[PDB]
Design a protein that fits this description.
The structure is a homotetramer. The first copy, chain A, has six helices and five strands, in the order βββαααβαβαα. With 137 residues, chain A is an alpha+beta fold. At the A-B interface, strand 5, helix 5 and helix 6 of A face helix 1, strand 5, helix 3 and helix 4 of B. The complex binds chloride ion (CL) (2 copies). Chains B, D: InterPro entries: Arc_rbn_hlx_hlx, HicB-like, TTHA1013/TTHA0281-like.
Chain lengths: 137, 135, 136, 135
């Protein structure tokens, strides 16, 4: 899953933050350091959490949000992208059972096969579940 | 069982609906998408309907006698036949299995234990999928 | 995958054919029968073609070709769908090797990650293969 | 290595290109789409170029100096950084494994006996792979 970052030049190096996550500043000197430095900052503030068993936040969907942000249009900020694998931060898998009506299951399966933004039922219902609970809106 | 569908060409593919089912339009691009997206609109609408305790539509007697239907020549349509399996739309309960991370499943539990106009996992994820698959 | 069939009301019930498949006629008495009578007509009609190691043709793609087909507005045909698993018919799965430049393989991965109508390399490259040889 | 991209708000989504790679533009709908679609346009363009033995592009010097580009403010855009690994785009061969049915496979093989602008399976499959993604 891909999270947004703003990157600013600074005199020796660059400093940046996750606009959608307070208390996540980062820095470094060559631009080749950005994503590495960033995820590490991300992971540090977050280890507070899911040693408590908390979930990764849902990543944003709307691009206009960021293309209209004044910090990018006028104050010289630069958009960047940190890619994260949830399997790495989230623990072991859990397999479990549900019951619902056939016609609903059918409806869901037919929805996934036409949308194709979804590889299976677990991914689909997991995606729907992480945003109701913890969205970055 | 057979429900007929009307299929109209559309600049970027096709356009369609069910003559027997009010409010059940579909569309797509490829040939494959005709049956697949029509059955999708059907499954969805027929989930809306029985979520809310409405009566389900039946298939018509002589589906083929839609050939002579006016709204079919008047526009430039053809007739289609989708075969739907009645077993797949029964409201019989059915058990299935999902995999996801511990963290997510714990949060779903805490959310449900707290915000409960939700008794358990199944109806939470069910209410959730209903809102999404809708249009 | 999904082949097109044309379907005609008769006095006895119905009859039809795969309009993209020469001489593959089928019929039956109720409409309940349509999907299985057509697939069995199918299964035999092309049985010759794969002792001879031919592949199933590719499901067409343009829906306009079909919507405007004379046989469907004019003579009163009814369009229908047969869904055909390629697993059976063609001999079993066989695993092999390829080489190509890392570049291109990278580009392929990303076209698949970005259009996700394909699933994986095997499905993506199989579909391209099938369509160069068959088309119509 | 970092390539700067100009990103433009479009009615439902975004629009964009790489100021250091002529002819490499991209578009999409969601935010994930941004870096994804951009690296994909890059991978495809980079393949077309070296396919036809053109000079490959190189990441510019100070990519941050682009925030002051007339091509950006005169059109309402923003600047983003895509990071790209050099290794993924080397020209050297790599081998891998594919799984498909015998009839298909041998259908290909005697399609590697006739039109021989197609010499072996890998070349054949790459030609069609190329044809497809150049679009
Ligand atoms: Cl970045
Ligand atoms: Cl059918």
């Amino acid at each position: 899953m891909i999270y947004p970052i703003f990157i600013f030049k600074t005199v020796e190096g660059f400093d940046g933050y996750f606009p959608d996550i307070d208390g996540c500043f980062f820095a470094g000197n060559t631009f080749a350091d950005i994503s590495k430095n960033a995820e590490e900052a991300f992971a540090v503030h977050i280890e507070a959490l899911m040693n408590e068993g908390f979930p990764l936040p849902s990543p944003p969907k709307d691009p206009h949000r960021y293309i209209d942000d004044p910090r990018l249009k006028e104050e010289g900020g630069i958009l960047g992208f940190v890619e994260i694998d949830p399997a790495k931060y989230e623990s072991k898998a859990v397999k479990f059972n549900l019951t619902m009506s056939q016609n609903l299951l059918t409806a869901i399966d037919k929805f996934i096969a036409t949308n194709r933004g979804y590889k299976n039922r677990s991914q689909f219902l997991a995606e729907l579940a992480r945003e109701k609970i913890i969205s970055l809106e």
